[PDB]
Amino acid sequence: ELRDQQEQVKEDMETKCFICGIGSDYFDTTPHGFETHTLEEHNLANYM
Amino acid sequence: VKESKRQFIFDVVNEGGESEKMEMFVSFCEDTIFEMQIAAQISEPRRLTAREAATAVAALLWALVTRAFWGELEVQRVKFLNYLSRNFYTLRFLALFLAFAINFILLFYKVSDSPPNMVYYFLEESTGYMEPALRCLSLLHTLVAFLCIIGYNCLKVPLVIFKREKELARKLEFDGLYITEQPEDDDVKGQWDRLVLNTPSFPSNYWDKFVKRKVLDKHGDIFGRERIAELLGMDLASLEITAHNERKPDPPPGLLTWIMSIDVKYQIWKFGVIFTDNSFLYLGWYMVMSLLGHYNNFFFAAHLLDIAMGVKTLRTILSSVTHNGKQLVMTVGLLAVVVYLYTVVAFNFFRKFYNKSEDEDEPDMKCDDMMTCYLFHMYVGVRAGGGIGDEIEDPAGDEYELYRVVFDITFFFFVIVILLAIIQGLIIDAFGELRDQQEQVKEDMETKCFICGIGSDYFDTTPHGFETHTLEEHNLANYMFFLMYLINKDETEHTGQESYVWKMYQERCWDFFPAGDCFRKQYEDQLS
Amino acid sequence: MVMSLLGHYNNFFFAAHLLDIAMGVKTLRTILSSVTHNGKQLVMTVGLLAVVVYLYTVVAFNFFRKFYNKSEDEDEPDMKCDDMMTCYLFHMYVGVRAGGGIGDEIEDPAGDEYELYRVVFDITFFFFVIVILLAIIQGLIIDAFG
Amino acid sequence: AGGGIGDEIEDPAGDEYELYRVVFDITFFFFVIVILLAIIQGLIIDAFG
Amino acid sequence: NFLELAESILEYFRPYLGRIEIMGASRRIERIYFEISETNRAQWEMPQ
Ligand SMILES: CCCCCCCC/C=C\CCCCCCCC(=O)OC[C@H](COP(=O)(O)OCC[N+](C)(C)C)OC(=O)CCCCCCC/C=C/CCCCCCCC
Ligand SMILES: CCCCCCCC/C=C\CCCCCCCC(=O)OC[C@H](COP(=O)(O)OCC[N+](C)(C)C)OC(=O)CCCCCCC/C=C\CCCCCCCC
Ligand SMILES: CCCCCCCC/C=C\CCCCCCCC(=O)OC[C@H](COP(=O)(O)OCC[N+](C)(C)C)OC(=O)CCCCCCC/C=C\CCCCCCCC
Ligand SMILES: [Zn+2]
Ligand SMILES: [Zn+2]
């Protein structure tokens, strides 16, 4: 159960944005789109 | 090569990320290309006796394992080394078989106080052919171990050197590891690498022979052209005077020429890398134990541990245990601490019950000192089926009976039941975690393309669209073949597209790899 | 059919037909498919156990022989580790089946020059053979179910 | 029994059927004590999951 | 062309130019730029 919880956390963080909730595919329409979105556009560190 | 590809895919999908996916892919392609070059190089142009029970059982186990003049010398030596490189794995299997045979023969030793307070260890066999067989088998095993070391050194060490040189060159040219920065002084790898930088033959296996220049020009303005030249052991005065005017002297071919043409510093660096390589050390230990086996035949039993390294099924079963090895070790430590606490309590309160002697005249108290009590607990209570209470005295009819029954029950539940349950659970969860990793790899490879990342549904819009896309359009084999073809082709013969990809590859820019896009998406409406 | 015919030669050959429940009953077939799903791994694990016990036998034969006297009559000793075949049979047959390993059955190490070497020997036997390898077998079955 | 029937019935050493008997006892221990009980534990553990 | 000219300043200030997205008063997603201090960024990178 603990392993499954960790895997679920990882999958969520790699599949959808934490802030807006949009899926990774839409962003990935552009090269490294999801990476750019989660590093520059919607960044938890930037919000804090 | 198929096994290497499978391992690479597993690594990328599970532990690898996404920003470095193409970097790892290109590294894998480079390693595969070098491996193919090496392969091309090496390629040639009733009553039952205990012994009766023993002979039948051995056949069953082996089946499990089986199921799972200078010019003349040079040519002969090259043929020999090529043969060893070609038959390296066969030689390893032969060594394993010889080890099993030697140990089967070992199973017939006997020890006596009289010849066939010293003792005689002699082999007891009715046939009498076993002892000569043991001698010849031991000699042959040692020979095969030596040949295995040579085969490894000629077949797989080149890849190790290639990877080390490649990594060091990339760090020098794109990180300025010894120019802009410095190793951290705990990075023994870099500290040792500081030796090949000035060596005349730094890129001996890596095919990029322009590394020294590339690095010099890129970092030259900031650090000058003389500091970089000193660090890389390259002479600008030479680079210019050679172009201006130079000579080609031909040294008289001979062993003297070979001796003068030896880059000791490189060779010394090469040997450090090899002797730090794990597999080479394993083979060396194998050879050392095989030699020791001629001093004492029973050292040949150490080579039975080679089954873990050899048999794939056993390797996986043992990887199940080692997956949570750190947790298992920490659990054993926790067990030790808990047993120590129980020892403290027993030493302070329950000492009258730890008399393990039947002779009333000669008591044997196992808990009159803390060291003895702790040893008793860890050695006897842990191994006991019901804990310490099974072995230490009965508590009935004593003032401390209830305190003691609580002591024993808690020992049984915490130590025997729970901690051991934790160990079994760690192993059982390791099995499931490995299975889940394999399933994840399969699901990813069947749901999305490795290169572009587009999902399978979009391609499947067309009959067998995903299959066609992954077999013809975006094929990992085709990409690797393109890298090989582009590396072999001359830059002067490169076409425009090839030149563009070559420049991006040289600059380590992986933007030419399609990402979230493909030919079908690009020309969707015209193609439709 | 052959076993049924042999059953008329000896009636006790008819017990072989009780194995037909595995083939017949579906629930039992599934339960046994759980065991046979990783049958190759189970067999290889048993082989690994045999090899490990052989290594322990080698060590015991070379160093700890005085402790393998399974006789109470001092006039008639019964040394179970004076030859490698006998010692290996003793280990595989008795230590594996023992609850706490070989140490439960072979002699007490207390008050001997090799006491610590021997307690390490026994504890390692118990942990590697009794605890871990059997844990591997249970884990293979449990993972087959899942 | 912890180790099967062999723990309780007589010692096989020094008998014409010693090897047949050690095979008997080891197979009993592995099939009954180790595997079938492992099946029971596995059924419970899989029910949880 | 201006961005190429100003690349140096942009690179120097890259680690300090924080950027977030909000749903603004205009009922449209708006992008806000602000300053991140070196002390704050170091504290963020602190392993705890
Ligand atoms: C999960 C599956 C369940 C397992 C079920 C039980 C497992 C049993 C396991 C292991 C083998 C133990 C040894 C078996 C006995 C051999 C003894 C022997 O060697 O004595 C040879 C005899 C000598 O002749 P006699 O004058 O004493 O006749 C006796 C006449 N009486 C019987 C009427 C008095 O010759 C004969 O009669 C033999 C003629 C008949 C041959 C078959 C008899 C034994 C069958 C054993 C099972 C098959 C092997 C099991 C495989 C391992 C389990 C996977
Ligand atoms: C990378 C993986 C690492 C794995 C490490 C495991 C390797 C095994 C271990 C240790 C070897 C240490 C070598 C040091 C000893 C130096 C040699 C020595 O001084 O030796 C003395 C005695 C020999 O006596 P002698 O003179 O009377 O011989 C008669 C010869 N004449 C008649 C000529 C006198 O040596 C004796 O006792 C001989 C008895 C030896 C029997 C035990 C050998 C080990 C075999 C099986 C167990 C393997 C252990 C596995 C543990 C690790 C698991 C991962
Ligand atoms: C595809 C799946 C394969 C599964 C294989 C398992 C089948 C069972 C095994 C082996 C049968 C081998 C047959 C060879 C023996 C030939 C016959 C023979 O020569 O027989 C001699 C003695 C009978 O003695 P008698 O002359 O005094 O009879 C009195 C008769 N008058 C008075 C007329 C003399 O035979 C005796 O001992 C009779 C005692 C027999 C009791 C054991 C029979 C087995 C029953 C249960 C265990 C099953 C084992 C399962 C192992 C595999 C698990 C997968
Ligand atoms: Zn977002
Ligand atoms: Zn694709």
C-alpha distances (whole Å) from B372 to each of B349, B368, C64, C111 are: 15, 7, 22, 11
* Burial class, B381, CB count within 10 angstroms (exposed 0-12 / middle 13-18 / buried 19+): buried
Atom 33, ligand 3: residue with shortest CA distance: C9
Residue with the two structure tokens 């708006």: E30
Cα–Cα distance between B303 and B97 in angstroms, integer? 10
Query: What is the DSSP secondary structure assignment for residue C71, as one 8-state letter?
Result: -
- Count CB atoms within 10 A of the CB of residue C67: 20
How far lies B214's CA from each of B170, B174, B218, B239, B493, in Å?
Answer: 11, 10, 6, 14, 22
Residue B522 identity: Q
A14 Cβ contact partners less than 8 Å away, ≥ 6 residues apart:
A24
Contacts of A3 in chain B (CB under 8 A): 429, 432-433
Residue closest to B215 by CA, chosen among B251, B242, B176: B176
What region does B397 belong to: left with phi over 0, alpha with psi -120 to 50, or beta? Answer: left
Interatomic CA distance for residues C77 and B128, integer angstroms = 29
CB neighbours of residue B218 within 10 Å: 15
DSSP D36: I
- In angstroms, this model's resolution equals 2.9
Question: Using CA atoms, how far apart are residues C56 and C88, in angstroms rounded to an integer?
Answer: 9
Annotate B245-265 with three-state secondary structure.
CCCCCCCCCCHHHHHHCCCHH
Evaluate whether chains E and C are touching (3 or more beta carbon pairs less than 8 Å apart).
Answer: no
Q: What is the chain B residue with the closest CA to C86? A: B50
State the DSSP H helix or E strand holding residue E22, giving kind and residue range, or none if neither.
strand E17-23
Contacts of C34 in chain D (CB under 8 A): 39, 42
CB contact under 8 Å between B314 and C43, yes or no, is no
B437 vs D46: CA distance, rounded Å: 19
Phi and psi dihedrals of B443, rounded to 5?
A: -65, -45
Q: Are E16 and E37 in contact (CB under 8 A)?
A: yes
Joined together, the tokens standing for residue B276 give 């730090």
CB-CB under 8 Å, B420 with C54:
no
Residue nearest to atom 28 of ligand 1 (CA): B46
Contact at CB, B385 and D19, closer than 8 angstroms: no
Q: How was this structure determined?
A: cryo-EM
Q: Are B123 and B130 in contact (CB under 8 A)?
A: yes
Q: How far is the CA of B179 from the centre of ligand 4 (A)?
A: 39
Q: Is D24 in the pocket of ligand 1 (CB under 6 A)?
A: yes
CA angle B181, B183, B184 (to 5 degrees): 110
Question: Which residue bears the tokens 């089954």?
Answer: B307
Mutate to test the pocket of ligand 3, among C1, C9, C18 (most ligand atoms within 8 A of CB): C9
CA gap B367, B373 in Å, rounded: 4
SS3 B14: helix
What is the separation of C-alpha B89 from the centre of its chain, rounded to a whole number of angstroms?
16
- For residues B491 and B429, the answer to whether their CB atoms sit within 8 Å is no
Length of chain E equals: 48
Is residue B468 classed as helix, strand or coil in its secondary structure?
helix
Distance (Å, rounded) from C-alpha B150 to C-alpha B171?
Answer: 31
In terms of residues, how long is chain A?
Answer: 48
- The answer to whether the Cβ–Cβ distance between B431 and C143 falls below 8 Å is yes
Neighbours of B36 (CB within 10 A): 13
Find out whether B517 and B473 touch, Cβ atoms under 8 Å.
no
Surface-to-core class of residue E23, CB atoms within 10 Å of its CB (0-12 exposed, 13-18 middle, 19+ buried): exposed
Distance of CA C59 to the CA centre of its chain: 18
Q: Establish whether residue C15 lines the binding site of ligand 3, counting it when its CB lies within 6 angstroms of any ligand atom.
A: yes
**B492: DSSP letter:** G
Residue type at position B103: N
When scoring B309, B311, B358, B379 by the number of chain C Cβ atoms within 10 A, the one with the most, hence best to mutate, is B379
Closest CA of chain B from A48, distance in Å: 25
Neighbours of chain B (3+ CB pairs under 8 A): A, C, D
C-alpha span between B321 and B308 (Å, rounded): 12
DSSP for residue B431: H
**Residues on chain D bordering chain C, Cβ-to-Cβ distance under 8 angstroms:** 2-4, 6-7, 13, 22, 25-26, 29-30, 34-35, 38-39, 41-43, 45-46, 49
* Rounded Cα gap, residues B463 and B343, in angstroms: 72
The helix (H) or strand (E) run that includes residue B408 is helix B401-411
Contact (CB, 8 A) for B517 and B452: yes
In single-letter form, the type of residue at position B24 comes to M
d(CA B133, CA B103): 12
Which of the other chains make 3 or more beta carbon contacts under 8 angstroms with chain D? Answer: B, C
* B482 C-alpha to ligand 4 centroid (Å): 37
Whether the CB-CB separation of C56 and C91 falls below 8 Å is answered with yes
Which residues touch C23 (CB under 8 Å, ≥6 apart)? Answer: C29
Q: Is E29 helix (H, G, I), strand (E, B) or coil?
A: strand
Breaks (C–N over 2.5 Å) after residues, chain D: none
CB-based contact B313:C44 (threshold 8 Å): yes
CA distances from B3 to B10, B374, C40, E45 (A): 11, 50, 21, 40
Q: How far apart are CA B310 and CA B69, in angstroms?
A: 40
Residue C35: which of B435, B312, D34, D25 has the closest Cα? D34
Determine the angle formed by the axes of helices B211-223 and B157-174, rounding to 10 degrees: 30
Which of D6, D30, D45 shows the shortest C-beta gap to C142? D45
Q: Is C13 in the pocket of ligand 3 (CB under 6 A)?
A: yes
- B-chain CB neighbours of A25 within 8 Å are 455
User: What is the CA angle B181-B184-B189, rounded to 5?
Assistant: 100
Task: State whether residue E44 sits within 8 Å of chain A by CB.
Answer: yes
Give every CB contact of residue B222 below 8 A, 6+ residues apart in sequence: B179, B180
Residue B331 corresponds to which tokens in the numbers above? 């659990």
Q: Which residues of D touch B428 (CB under 8 A)?
A: 45
List, chain by chain if needed, residues with CB within 6 Å of any ligand 2 atom: B 285, 295-296, 298-299, 301-302; C 55, 58-59, 62
Q: Scanning the structure block, which residue is given the tokens 């790892």?
A: B24
Residues of A in contact with E44 (CB under 8 A): 45, 48
**In chain B, which residue's Cα lies nearest the Cα of D16?**
B47
User: B516 and A31: CB-CB below 8 Å?
Assistant: yes
**Alpha-carbon span B363 to B376, nearest angstrom:** 16
Could you say which of C46, C97, C141 has the minimum Cβ distance to residue D42? C141
Question: Three-state DSSP class for E9?
Answer: helix
φ/ψ (deg, to 5) at B331? -65, -40
B176-212 in b/e burial notation, b at 16+ Cβ within 10 A? Answer: bbbbeeebeeeeeebebbeebbebeebbbbbeeeebb
Closest ligand 3 atom to residue C13 Cα is 43
What letters, b where the CB count within 10 A reaches 16 and e where it falls short, cover B425-438? bbbbbbbbeeeeee
CA distance B97 to B86: 19
Gap between the Cα atoms of B216 and B172, Å rounded: 10
CA of A38 to the centre of ligand 4 (A): 6
Classify residue E48 by its DSSP letter: -
Contacting subunits of E (3+ beta carbon pairs below 8 A): A
With the C-alpha atoms ordered B501, B503, B508, B511, is the resulting torsion angle positive or negative? Answer: negative
Residue E20 backbone dihedrals phi, psi, to 5 degrees: -135, 170
Find, among A15, A1, A31, the residue nearest to B513 by Cα. Answer: A31
DSSP assignments along B171-225, one per residue: HHHHT-TTTTS---SS-HHHHHHTTTTTSTTSSSSSS-TTHHHHHHHHHHHHHTT
Best CA proximity match to B335, nearest among D34, C136, C99, C126: C126
Query: What span, in angstroms and rounded, lies between the C-alpha atoms of B110 and C83?
Result: 4
